[PDB]
Amino acid sequence: QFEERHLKFLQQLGKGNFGSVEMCRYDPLQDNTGEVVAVKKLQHSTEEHLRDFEREIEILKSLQHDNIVKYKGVCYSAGRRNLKLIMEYLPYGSLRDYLQKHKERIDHIKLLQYTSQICKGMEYLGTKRYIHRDLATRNILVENENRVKIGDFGLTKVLPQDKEYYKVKEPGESPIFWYAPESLTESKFSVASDVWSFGVVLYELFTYIEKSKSPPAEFMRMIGNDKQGQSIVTHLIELLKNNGRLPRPDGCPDEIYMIMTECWNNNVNQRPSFRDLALRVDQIRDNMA
Ligand SMILES: CCc1cc(O)c(F)cc1-c1cc(N[C@@H](C)CO)c2nc(N)ncc2c1
């Protein structure tokens, strides 16, 4: 158990789904020798978001994989309504920030190593019947130059026993530029819609997070920058239905763009599996190395 009185605030790490992440030192000996941890807390500790946060905690606790952020514990000290989630602190930050800082200094071999690691964490997630729903480089963390881990399980849903999809009745904030067409039209999330988002993550990696090339900038340019609010969703659905897709990033290998376009299939059943994606990406890495 982690006592709040010993959790020393060090710095703000960012905002996750429905909360804030802080870098803290868990220092029970009060000599500044304690472990540095990442702590998620709720900004608005309501009954609905406390229920989702408790589910996120249970989901993360059940996951043990090299490419999934490690759960460490929970801090109850501030009562049952003010829970804190304690996770390992990944010192190189989000993959989005890491790539935007180093750009083309991260070679293609290195990008494919991270791609393979993302596939493996996601494939492991699917064996548990969890649908991440928010796969993006902003939610992927860098442990060191050789390892990335999937983070932010805030939107993660568990598939019902008798269904291959989860229908979200009243959506909250939704990362629509990473969404599969059926997630936009019917609010249906499955392993197949996570594969669609994975194709978007692969696109983010090979654009090196060049601002004007981001999935929102590119899709807005395709539907027209004059579209606003709900109209964006309406026009994005029509664009995807008519095979409007993100372009091939400048300098991206043909083989890598072929994977992205296969992930972006309107037919749910034709999208590749994460097992097949990790095998294909590993073969590509082997053909390069
Ligand atoms: C949103 C909190 C959270 C919840 C989860 O369910 C989860 F699996 C991971 C995280 C999380 C998130 C961070 N940063 C966020 C700002 C980027 O999305 C972390 N940043 C660093 N450097 N280290 C570890 C971090 C762990």
UniProtKB/Swiss-Prot annotation:
Residues carrying Phosphotyrosine: Y26, Y124, Y130, Y165, Y166
Signal peptide segment: none
Domain (Protein kinase) ranges: 7-282
Active site, renumbered: D134
Tissues showing expression: Ubiquitously expressed throughout most tissues.
Highest rank taxon of the organism: Eukaryota
PTM summary: Autophosphorylated, leading to regulate its activity. Autophosphorylation on Tyr-26, Tyr-124 and Tyr-130 in response to growth hormone (GH) are required for maximal kinase activity. Also phosphorylated by TEC. Phosphorylated on tyrosine residues in response to interferon gamma signaling. Phosphorylated on tyrosine residues in response to a signaling cascade that is activated by increased cellular retinol.
Binding site for ATP: L13, G14, K15, G16, N17, F18, G19, S20, V21, K40
Outcome, altering K40E: Loss of ability to up-regulate potassium voltage-gated channel activity of KCNA3
Protein's cellular compartments: Endomembrane system; Cytoplasm; Nucleus
Disease affiliated with this protein: Chromosomal aberrations involving JAK2 are found in both chronic and acute forms of eosinophilic, lymphoblastic and myeloid leukemia. Translocation t(8;9)(p22;p24) with PCM1 links the protein kinase domain of JAK2 to the major portion of PCM1. Translocation t(9;12)(p24;p13) with ETV6.
Purpose: Non-receptor tyrosine kinase involved in various processes such as cell growth, development, differentiation or histone modifications. Mediates essential signaling events in both innate and adaptive immunity. In the cytoplasm, plays a pivotal role in signal transduction via its association with type I receptors such as growth hormone (GHR), prolactin (PRLR), leptin (LEPR), erythropoietin (EPOR), thrombopoietin receptor (MPL/TPOR); or type II receptors including IFN-alpha, IFN-beta, IFN-gamma and multiple interleukins.
Domain notes per entry: Possesses 2 protein kinase domains. The second one probably contains the catalytic domain, while the presence of slight differences suggest a different role for protein kinase 1.
Quaternary structure (record): Interacts with EPOR, LYN, SIRPA, SH2B1 and TEC. Interacts with IL23R. Interacts with SKB1. Interacts with STAM2. Interacts with IFNGR2 (via intracellular domain). Interacts with LEPR (Isoform B). Interacts with HSP90AB1; promotes functional activation in a heat shock-dependent manner. Interacts with STRA6. Interacts with RHEX; this interaction occurs in a erythropoietin (EPO)-dependent manner. Interacts with ASB2; the interaction targets JAK2 for Notch-induced proteasomal degradation. Interacts with MPL/TPOR.
Family the entry assigns: Belongs to the protein kinase superfamily. Tyr protein kinase family. JAK subfamily.
Name of the featured protein: Tyrosine-protein kinase JAK2
Residues of the full protein shown: 843 to 1131 of 1132
